[PDB]
Coordinates of C-alpha atoms and ligand atoms in Angstrom, one line a residue:
Chain A
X1 CA 93.4 130.3 123.4
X2 CA 92.5 127.9 120.7
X3 CA 92.6 124.1 120.6
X4 CA 94.5 122.5 117.8
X5 CA 92.4 120.8 115.2
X6 CA 92.7 118.5 112.2
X7 CA 95.5 116.6 113.8
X8 CA 96.9 114.2 111.2
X9 CA 99.7 111.7 110.8
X10 CA 102.0 112.0 107.8
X11 CA 104.2 109.0 107.7
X12 CA 106.4 107.3 105.1
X13 CA 108.9 104.6 105.7
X14 CA 108.3 105.0 109.4
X15 CA 109.5 108.6 109.2
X16 CA 106.6 110.1 111.1
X17 CA 105.2 113.6 111.5
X18 CA 102.2 114.9 113.2
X19 CA 100.7 118.0 111.7
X20 CA 97.7 120.1 112.9
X21 CA 96.1 123.5 112.8
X22 CA 95.8 126.4 113.3
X23 CA 99.0 128.5 112.8
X24 CA 99.6 130.0 116.2
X25 CA 98.4 133.4 117.0
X26 CA 100.1 134.4 120.3
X27 CA 100.1 130.8 121.5
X28 CA 102.5 127.9 121.5
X29 CA 102.1 124.1 121.5
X30 CA 103.5 121.0 123.1
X31 CA 103.0 117.5 121.8
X32 CA 102.4 114.4 124.0
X33 CA 102.6 110.9 122.5
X34 CA 102.2 107.5 124.2
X35 CA 101.2 103.9 123.6
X36 CA 97.7 102.9 124.8
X37 CA 99.0 102.2 128.2
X38 CA 102.6 103.8 128.4
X39 CA 103.3 107.1 130.1
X40 CA 103.0 110.2 128.0
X41 CA 106.2 111.8 126.6
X42 CA 106.6 115.4 125.6
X43 CA 108.2 116.6 122.3
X44 CA 108.3 120.0 120.5
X45 CA 108.1 122.1 123.6
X46 CA 106.4 125.5 123.3
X47 CA 106.8 125.6 119.5
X48 CA 105.0 128.0 117.1
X49 CA 105.4 125.2 114.5
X50 CA 102.2 123.3 113.6
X51 CA 104.0 120.0 113.1
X52 CA 106.1 117.6 115.3
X53 CA 108.4 114.8 114.3
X54 CA 107.5 111.8 116.4
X55 CA 109.7 109.3 114.5
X56 CA 112.1 108.6 117.3
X57 CA 109.3 107.7 119.7
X58 CA 107.3 105.5 117.3
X59 CA 110.2 103.5 115.9
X60 CA 110.9 102.2 119.5
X61 CA 108.0 99.7 118.9
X62 CA 106.4 99.9 115.4
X63 CA 103.7 97.3 116.3
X64 CA 102.2 99.4 119.1
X65 CA 99.3 101.9 118.6
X66 CA 100.2 105.5 119.5
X67 CA 98.0 108.4 120.5
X68 CA 99.5 112.0 120.4
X69 CA 97.7 115.2 121.7
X70 CA 98.8 118.7 121.2
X71 CA 98.6 121.4 124.0
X72 CA 98.0 125.1 123.5
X73 CA 99.3 127.8 125.8
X74 CA 99.2 131.6 125.8
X75 CA 102.0 134.1 125.6
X76 CA 103.2 134.0 128.3
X77 CA 102.3 130.7 130.0
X78 CA 102.0 127.5 131.4
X79 CA 98.4 127.2 132.5
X80 CA 95.5 126.4 132.4
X81 CA 91.8 125.2 131.7
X82 CA 89.8 127.2 134.2
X83 CA 87.8 125.1 134.5
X84 CA 89.7 121.9 135.1
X85 CA 93.1 123.5 135.8
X86 CA 94.9 121.7 133.1
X87 CA 96.3 122.7 129.7
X88 CA 93.8 122.8 126.8
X89 CA 94.8 120.0 124.3
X90 CA 93.3 118.0 121.6
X91 CA 93.9 114.3 120.6
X92 CA 95.3 112.8 117.4
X93 CA 93.8 109.7 115.7
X94 CA 95.3 106.5 116.9
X95 CA 98.3 105.3 114.8
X96 CA 100.0 101.9 114.4
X97 CA 103.1 102.3 112.4
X98 CA 103.6 98.7 111.2
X99 CA 100.1 98.9 109.6
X100 CA 99.6 102.5 108.3
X101 CA 103.0 104.0 107.4
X102 CA 103.2 104.7 103.6
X103 CA 105.7 102.4 101.9
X104 CA 108.1 104.5 100.1
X105 CA 108.2 104.5 96.3
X106 CA 110.7 101.7 95.6
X107 CA 113.5 101.8 93.1
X108 CA 114.5 99.0 90.7
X109 CA 118.2 98.3 91.0
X110 CA 119.6 95.7 88.5
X111 CA 118.2 94.4 85.2
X112 CA 120.8 91.7 84.2
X113 CA 119.2 90.0 81.1
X114 CA 120.7 86.5 81.3
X115 CA 119.3 84.1 78.8
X116 CA 115.8 84.0 77.3
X117 CA 114.9 85.7 80.6
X118 CA 115.4 89.2 82.2
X119 CA 116.0 89.2 85.9
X120 CA 114.8 92.6 87.4
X121 CA 115.8 93.1 91.0
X122 CA 114.2 95.6 93.5
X123 CA 116.2 97.4 96.2
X124 CA 115.9 96.6 100.0
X125 CA 115.5 100.4 100.9
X126 CA 116.4 101.5 104.4
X127 CA 113.6 102.7 106.8
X128 CA 113.7 105.2 109.8
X129 CA 113.7 102.2 112.1
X130 CA 117.0 101.8 113.9
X131 CA 118.8 98.9 115.8
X132 CA 121.9 100.2 117.5
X133 CA 122.1 103.6 115.9
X134 CA 121.9 101.9 112.4
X135 CA 118.8 101.7 110.0
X136 CA 116.8 98.6 109.4
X137 CA 115.6 97.9 105.8
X138 CA 112.1 97.4 104.4
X139 CA 112.8 93.6 104.4
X140 CA 114.1 93.7 108.0
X141 CA 110.9 95.2 109.3
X142 CA 108.3 93.4 107.1
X143 CA 109.7 90.0 106.3
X144 CA 107.3 87.5 104.6
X145 CA 104.6 90.4 105.0
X146 CA 106.0 92.3 102.0
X147 CA 105.7 91.2 98.4
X148 CA 106.3 93.2 95.1
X149 CA 104.4 93.7 91.9
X150 CA 105.9 94.2 88.5
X151 CA 104.3 95.7 85.4
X152 CA 106.6 95.1 82.3
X153 CA 100.4 93.1 81.8
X154 CA 101.6 92.0 85.4
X155 CA 103.9 89.7 87.5
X156 CA 104.8 89.4 91.2
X157 CA 107.2 88.0 93.8
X158 CA 107.8 87.9 97.5
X159 CA 111.5 87.9 97.3
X160 CA 113.3 91.1 96.2
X161 CA 113.8 89.6 92.7
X162 CA 111.6 88.8 89.6
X163 CA 112.3 86.7 86.4
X164 CA 110.4 86.9 83.1
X165 CA 111.0 86.3 79.3
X166 CA 110.7 87.5 75.6
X167 CA 107.7 98.8 80.4
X168 CA 109.3 98.0 83.8
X169 CA 107.7 99.6 87.0
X170 CA 107.4 98.1 90.6
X171 CA 105.3 98.3 93.7
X172 CA 105.8 97.3 97.3
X173 CA 102.7 95.5 98.7
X174 CA 101.7 94.3 102.1
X175 CA 98.6 92.1 101.5
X176 CA 97.6 91.7 105.2
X177 CA 97.0 95.5 105.4
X178 CA 93.5 96.9 105.8
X179 CA 94.8 100.3 104.6
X180 CA 97.7 101.8 102.6
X181 CA 98.1 98.2 101.2
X182 CA 100.0 99.2 98.0
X183 CA 103.1 101.5 97.7
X184 CA 103.5 103.9 94.8
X185 CA 105.1 102.8 91.4
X186 CA 108.9 102.9 91.3
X187 CA 110.2 105.2 88.7
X188 CA 109.9 103.3 85.3
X189 CA 113.0 101.6 83.7
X190 CA 114.5 99.6 80.8
Chain B
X1 CA 113.4 116.8 94.8
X2 CA 116.1 116.4 97.4
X3 CA 118.1 118.8 95.1
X4 CA 117.8 121.7 97.5
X5 CA 119.7 119.8 100.3
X6 CA 117.0 120.4 103.0
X7 CA 118.4 118.0 105.6
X8 CA 120.5 119.9 108.1
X9 CA 123.0 118.7 110.7
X10 CA 124.6 116.0 108.6
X11 CA 121.5 114.0 107.6
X12 CA 120.8 112.2 104.4
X13 CA 117.9 113.0 102.1
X14 CA 115.8 110.4 100.1
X15 CA 113.4 112.0 97.6
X16 CA 109.9 110.8 97.3
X17 CA 106.9 111.2 95.0
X18 CA 105.9 114.8 95.6
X19 CA 108.5 115.0 98.5
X20 CA 111.5 113.7 100.5
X21 CA 112.4 112.1 103.8
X22 CA 115.4 113.0 106.1
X23 CA 117.3 110.3 107.8
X24 CA 118.9 112.1 110.8
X25 CA 122.1 111.4 112.8
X26 CA 121.5 110.0 116.3
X27 CA 121.5 113.5 118.1
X28 CA 118.9 115.1 115.8
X29 CA 115.3 114.9 114.8
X30 CA 112.8 116.9 112.8
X31 CA 111.6 117.0 109.3
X32 CA 114.9 118.5 108.3
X33 CA 117.0 117.2 111.2
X34 CA 116.9 120.8 112.5
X35 CA 116.0 119.8 116.1
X36 CA 118.8 119.4 118.7
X37 CA 118.3 116.5 121.0
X38 CA 121.3 117.5 123.2
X39 CA 119.4 120.7 123.9
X40 CA 116.2 120.3 125.7
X41 CA 117.3 119.6 129.3
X42 CA 114.2 121.2 130.8
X43 CA 111.8 119.9 133.6
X44 CA 108.8 119.3 131.5
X45 CA 110.9 117.0 129.4
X46 CA 111.3 113.6 131.2
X47 CA 111.7 115.4 134.4
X48 CA 115.0 117.1 133.4
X49 CA 116.4 113.5 133.7
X50 CA 116.2 114.0 137.5
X51 CA 115.2 111.0 139.7
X52 CA 113.1 113.1 141.9
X53 CA 112.8 116.9 141.9
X54 CA 113.6 119.3 139.1
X55 CA 114.4 123.0 139.1
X56 CA 114.8 125.0 135.9
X57 CA 117.1 128.0 136.1
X58 CA 117.2 131.2 134.1
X59 CA 120.2 131.0 131.9
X60 CA 121.9 128.1 133.4
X61 CA 121.4 124.3 133.7
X62 CA 118.5 122.9 135.6
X63 CA 119.4 121.4 138.9
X64 CA 118.0 118.2 140.5
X65 CA 116.9 117.9 144.1
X66 CA 115.6 115.2 146.5
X67 CA 112.8 114.6 148.9
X68 CA 113.6 114.6 152.7
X69 CA 115.1 111.3 153.7
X70 CA 117.2 111.5 150.5
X71 CA 120.3 113.2 149.3
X72 CA 121.6 113.9 145.8
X73 CA 124.3 111.6 144.4
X74 CA 127.6 112.6 142.6
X75 CA 126.1 112.2 139.1
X76 CA 123.8 115.2 140.1
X77 CA 120.5 113.4 139.1
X78 CA 120.0 110.3 141.4
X79 CA 118.9 110.2 145.0
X80 CA 119.9 107.9 147.8
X81 CA 118.2 107.2 151.1
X82 CA 119.8 108.9 154.0
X83 CA 117.4 107.3 156.5
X84 CA 116.2 103.9 157.6
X85 CA 112.7 103.9 156.2
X86 CA 112.6 106.5 153.3
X87 CA 109.1 107.6 152.3
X88 CA 107.6 105.9 149.2
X89 CA 110.0 102.8 149.3
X90 CA 108.7 99.3 150.0
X91 CA 111.2 97.5 152.4
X92 CA 109.8 94.0 151.7
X93 CA 110.7 94.6 148.0
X94 CA 113.9 96.6 148.7
Chain C
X1 CA 88.1 97.9 145.3
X2 CA 86.1 96.3 142.6
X3 CA 88.2 94.0 140.3
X4 CA 91.5 94.2 142.1
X5 CA 93.9 91.8 143.8
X6 CA 94.9 91.1 147.4
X7 CA 97.8 93.3 148.1
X8 CA 100.6 91.0 149.5
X9 CA 101.4 91.8 153.2
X10 CA 103.6 94.9 153.5
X11 CA 103.4 96.0 149.9
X12 CA 101.1 98.9 150.7
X13 CA 102.9 100.0 153.9
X14 CA 101.4 103.5 154.0
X15 CA 97.9 102.1 154.0
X16 CA 95.8 103.3 157.0
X17 CA 92.5 101.9 158.3
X18 CA 90.3 104.3 160.2
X19 CA 87.8 102.9 162.7
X20 CA 85.1 104.5 164.9
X21 CA 84.0 102.4 167.8
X22 CA 85.9 99.6 166.2
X23 CA 83.8 99.8 163.1
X24 CA 85.3 100.5 159.6
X25 CA 85.1 104.2 158.5
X26 CA 87.7 104.9 155.8
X27 CA 91.2 104.4 154.3
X28 CA 93.9 107.0 154.7
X29 CA 97.6 107.3 153.8
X30 CA 100.5 107.7 156.1
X31 CA 102.6 110.7 155.1
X32 CA 104.7 110.7 158.3
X33 CA 104.9 109.2 161.7
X34 CA 102.0 111.3 163.0
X35 CA 100.1 112.6 159.9
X36 CA 97.7 110.7 157.9
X37 CA 95.8 112.0 154.8
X38 CA 92.1 111.0 154.4
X39 CA 88.9 112.2 152.7
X40 CA 86.8 114.9 154.4
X41 CA 83.5 113.3 153.7
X42 CA 84.3 110.3 156.0
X43 CA 83.9 112.6 159.0
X44 CA 80.5 113.9 158.0
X45 CA 78.6 111.8 160.6
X46 CA 81.1 110.8 163.4
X47 CA 79.1 110.6 166.8
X48 CA 82.0 110.3 169.4
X49 CA 85.5 111.6 168.4
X50 CA 87.0 110.3 171.7
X51 CA 87.7 107.1 169.6
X52 CA 88.7 107.7 166.2
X53 CA 91.5 105.3 165.7
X54 CA 94.0 104.7 162.9
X55 CA 95.5 101.4 162.2
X56 CA 98.9 101.0 160.5
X57 CA 100.4 97.8 159.3
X58 CA 97.0 96.3 159.0
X59 CA 96.4 93.7 156.3
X60 CA 93.9 90.9 157.2
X61 CA 91.1 92.6 159.2
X62 CA 89.8 89.4 160.7
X63 CA 92.7 88.7 163.2
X64 CA 95.8 89.9 164.4
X65 CA 99.4 89.1 163.7
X66 CA 102.5 91.1 164.6
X67 CA 102.1 94.2 162.7
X68 CA 99.3 96.6 163.4
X69 CA 99.7 99.8 165.4
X70 CA 96.7 101.7 166.6
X71 CA 96.6 105.3 167.5
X72 CA 93.9 107.7 168.7
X73 CA 93.4 110.4 166.2
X74 CA 94.1 113.7 168.0
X75 CA 92.8 116.1 165.3
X76 CA 91.0 116.0 162.0
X77 CA 91.7 119.0 159.9
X78 CA 89.5 119.6 156.7
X79 CA 89.7 122.5 154.2
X80 CA 87.4 125.4 155.1
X81 CA 85.9 125.3 151.5
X82 CA 84.7 121.7 151.9
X83 CA 81.0 121.6 152.4
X84 CA 79.5 118.6 154.1
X85 CA 77.6 116.4 151.8
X86 CA 79.2 117.7 148.6
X87 CA 82.2 116.5 146.6
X88 CA 84.6 119.4 146.2
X89 CA 87.7 119.7 148.4
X90 CA 87.5 116.2 149.8
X91 CA 90.7 116.0 151.8
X92 CA 91.3 115.7 155.6
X93 CA 94.6 115.7 157.4
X94 CA 94.8 113.8 160.7
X95 CA 97.2 114.2 163.6
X96 CA 97.8 111.0 165.5
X97 CA 98.1 111.3 169.4
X98 CA 101.4 109.5 169.2
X99 CA 103.6 108.7 166.3
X100 CA 103.5 105.2 164.8
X101 CA 106.8 103.4 164.5
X102 CA 108.2 102.8 161.0
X103 CA 108.9 99.1 160.2
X104 CA 109.0 96.8 157.3
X105 CA 105.2 97.0 157.4
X106 CA 104.6 100.7 158.3
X107 CA 106.1 103.4 155.9
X108 CA 105.1 106.9 154.8
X109 CA 104.1 107.7 151.2
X110 CA 106.1 110.7 149.7
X111 CA 103.9 113.8 149.5
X112 CA 105.5 115.2 146.2
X113 CA 106.3 118.8 145.4
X114 CA 103.5 120.4 143.5
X115 CA 105.1 121.2 140.2
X116 CA 106.8 117.7 140.1
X117 CA 103.3 116.4 140.6
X118 CA 101.7 118.5 137.9
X119 CA 104.4 118.0 135.4
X120 CA 105.8 114.5 135.8
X121 CA 103.6 112.4 138.0
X122 CA 100.4 113.5 136.3
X123 CA 101.6 111.7 133.1
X124 CA 102.7 108.5 134.6
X125 CA 99.8 106.4 133.3
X126 CA 99.0 103.8 135.9
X127 CA 98.7 104.3 139.6
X128 CA 97.6 102.0 142.5
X129 CA 94.4 102.5 144.6
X130 CA 93.8 100.3 147.6
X131 CA 91.4 99.5 150.4
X132 CA 89.1 97.3 152.4
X133 CA 85.9 98.7 151.0
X134 CA 83.1 97.0 149.0
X135 CA 84.3 94.5 146.5
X136 CA 81.3 95.3 144.3
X137 CA 78.7 98.1 144.2
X138 CA 76.3 96.5 146.5
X139 CA 78.4 93.9 148.1
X140 CA 80.7 92.8 150.8
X141 CA 83.6 94.9 152.1
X142 CA 87.0 93.1 152.0
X143 CA 88.9 91.5 154.7
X144 CA 92.3 91.4 153.1
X145 CA 93.8 94.6 151.7
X146 CA 92.7 95.0 148.1
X147 CA 94.9 96.8 145.5
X148 CA 94.0 97.9 141.8
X149 CA 96.0 99.6 139.0
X150 CA 94.0 102.4 137.2
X151 CA 95.1 104.7 134.3
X152 CA 94.7 108.5 134.9
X153 CA 92.7 110.7 132.6
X154 CA 92.9 114.4 131.8
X155 CA 89.5 116.0 132.6
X156 CA 88.6 116.7 128.9
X157 CA 88.9 112.9 128.2
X158 CA 86.9 112.2 131.4
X159 CA 84.1 114.6 130.3
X160 CA 84.2 113.2 126.7
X161 CA 84.0 109.5 127.7
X162 CA 81.4 109.6 130.4
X163 CA 77.6 109.2 130.0
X164 CA 75.8 112.4 131.1
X165 CA 73.7 112.1 134.3
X166 CA 71.0 114.1 135.9
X167 CA 72.7 116.1 138.7
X168 CA 76.1 114.4 138.8
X169 CA 78.6 116.9 140.3
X170 CA 81.3 118.9 138.4
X171 CA 84.7 117.3 138.0
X172 CA 86.7 120.4 139.3
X173 CA 90.4 121.3 139.2
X174 CA 90.6 119.6 142.6
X175 CA 89.6 116.3 141.2
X176 CA 90.7 113.8 138.4
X177 CA 89.2 110.4 137.1
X178 CA 91.5 107.1 136.5
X179 CA 89.8 103.8 136.1
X180 CA 87.9 102.0 133.4
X181 CA 84.5 102.8 131.9
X182 CA 83.7 99.3 130.9
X183 CA 82.4 98.4 134.4
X184 CA 85.2 96.0 135.5
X185 CA 87.4 97.9 137.9
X186 CA 87.0 100.8 140.3
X187 CA 87.4 102.0 143.8
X188 CA 84.3 101.6 145.8
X189 CA 82.6 102.7 149.1
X190 CA 84.9 102.3 152.1
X191 CA 88.0 102.8 149.9
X192 CA 87.4 106.4 150.5
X193 CA 90.1 108.4 152.0
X194 CA 92.9 106.1 150.8
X195 CA 95.6 106.5 148.2
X196 CA 96.1 106.7 144.5
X197 CA 99.9 106.2 144.4
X198 CA 102.1 106.8 141.5
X199 CA 105.4 104.9 141.0
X200 CA 108.2 107.0 139.5
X201 CA 111.7 105.8 139.1
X202 CA 111.8 103.7 142.2
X203 CA 109.8 105.8 144.6
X204 CA 106.0 106.1 145.1
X205 CA 104.1 109.4 145.7
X206 CA 100.5 110.2 146.7
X207 CA 98.8 111.7 143.6
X208 CA 95.3 111.2 144.7
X209 CA 92.7 110.2 147.2
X210 CA 89.6 108.0 146.7
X211 CA 86.7 110.5 146.8
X212 CA 83.5 109.7 144.8
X213 CA 81.9 107.9 142.1
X214 CA 78.8 107.1 140.1
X215 CA 78.3 103.8 141.9
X216 CA 81.3 101.6 141.4
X217 CA 82.5 100.0 138.2
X218 CA 79.4 101.6 136.6
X219 CA 79.4 101.3 132.8
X220 CA 80.2 104.6 131.3
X221 CA 81.9 106.2 134.3
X222 CA 85.3 106.5 135.9
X223 CA 86.5 106.8 139.5
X224 CA 87.0 110.4 140.7
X225 CA 89.8 111.3 143.1
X226 CA 91.0 114.3 145.0
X227 CA 93.9 115.9 143.2
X228 CA 96.5 116.0 145.9
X229 CA 98.7 118.5 144.0
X230 CA 96.3 121.3 144.8
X231 CA 96.7 120.8 148.6
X232 CA 100.4 120.2 149.0
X233 CA 101.3 123.6 150.5
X234 CA 98.1 123.5 152.5
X235 CA 99.2 120.1 153.8
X236 CA 102.6 121.3 154.6
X237 CA 101.8 124.6 156.4
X238 CA 99.5 122.5 158.6
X239 CA 102.1 119.9 159.4
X240 CA 104.7 122.6 160.3
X241 CA 102.6 124.8 162.5
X242 CA 101.5 124.8 166.1
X243 CA 98.8 122.4 167.4
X244 CA 95.5 124.0 168.1
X245 CA 92.8 122.9 170.5
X246 CA 89.7 121.0 169.2
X247 CA 89.2 117.7 167.3
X248 CA 87.7 118.9 164.0
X249 CA 89.4 121.9 162.6
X250 CA 88.4 123.9 159.5
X251 CA 91.6 125.4 158.3
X252 CA 91.5 128.2 155.7
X253 CA 92.0 127.2 152.0
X254 CA 93.8 128.0 150.0
Ligands
BGC301 C1 114.9 122.7 99.5 O1 114.3 122.2 98.3 C2 113.2 121.4 98.5 C3 112.7 120.7 97.1 O2 113.7 120.0 96.3 C4 112.1 122.2 99.2 O3 110.8 121.7 99.3 C5 112.7 122.5 100.6 O4 111.7 123.1 101.4 C6 113.9 123.4 100.5 O5 114.5 123.8 101.7
FUC302 C1 123.1 109.3 105.1 O1 122.6 108.8 106.3 C2 122.6 109.8 107.4 C3 122.0 109.2 108.7 C4 124.0 110.2 107.6 O2 124.8 109.0 107.8 C5 124.6 110.9 106.4 O3 125.9 111.3 106.6 C6 124.5 109.9 105.3 O4 124.9 110.5 104.1
CA303 CA1 95.5 91.7 160.9

């Protein structure tokens, strides 16, 4: 019976998946996830998949740090290390959604070219984070934490709108981030 | 990239650089919304939703049960003391 | 208990204090009116059994309010695989001579079903250990009941996080570790035999027993407990069956 390895978090816009290896040869897996002091909660019971969507659990508090671990079982079973009499498992890296989730590639929506100035506006794109069955937007979750970055040489704003004068691609940015600080360039427009 | 409509069960797809992302309806999860929430009432999952004891059954719904001193309520999941000092309850806090 | 708090009176009502000759021995847990669960190793020395006594409803050891009830302990049953002086199979079950009386202040802890206990209670993160033992590795035993919340670990985590030691015993399938490895909070000597108790939707359940230890609150180590889930059907066969003569009994295990 083989322990999972290379457990990794793939996350964009809070949509969150844990992947690991190997592909199961006569064994199944169960994932446990938990905050650093919550109880553990099972997902993906006895799957032969090597991934698990943990989005629902992690969007319940995006500022918490989560640990997941993945258990391996035979056949068959339901038992055991033998040895310690528990399921063989392995641990994921820690994961703190608010600080590590990849910002999705934004999309410019509006280019009204008013006077001597063009006003290019960026879209407040929905995330996997829900309040009452409905989805919060990037701006709802990050507030004054998220700025944007325009190439058109470069500009920048911390609202969802720019304004320049006499080509166009954007960039979500969270400056306070140690990692995945910069989104990926919106698809280029004009 | 979303062009192959990969979100099942009514979900929306939003394409990404080199991939996509499914926004699922409330009762579904999974990469492709393929996972049925309504559908994993088993004991190793939050205790089958039972307050105390869980029994899984071949082919049928799991049933809940109670410790001695307790009896199962109408809702089929909760327990209620049937005695004066039930085990594992703190009367000063009750 | 190193690093805990005073348990407010009657908030650990299943807490038992074991005395020999009026001297502190151990903790225990009340699982019904006549049966207390303790730790085998407490009974390794015991000169005169005549006076074994369990105290229920005890709180402040230094004086005497309404609530205590004392009982002679009629029998001490320990697993037949326990070997005196070693760590494995550290559980004892004690028959009181007469039942205690359940009050505000004296209440049994639920002995859970085994698979409930493997499956659900083992993944409730925090549980309470309590006692009147030493408040620090070499220090003074307590006088009011001390309580402490520790997190449980799966044994692989335990083995991974602990400093290796010449000759420290194996953490077996009859054991688990909960506690902290930064040296702040642990159970300690004289906490033995009492309860690690898990709260789950409104009811509390024995999940473990205080057992052993590299010192207490030692940097690099966790508390080790007896995994009560292995002995549930042993505990129950014994409680259901017919009293036998003798004070110490070695009952077959499994
Ligand atoms: C539908 O099509 C996408 C790409 O547009 C593919 O990656 C999915 O796996 C498929 O189901
Ligand atoms: C996109 O959002 C998802 C959650 C569902 O509402 C779909 O019907 C919709 O198109
Ligand atoms: Ca007293």
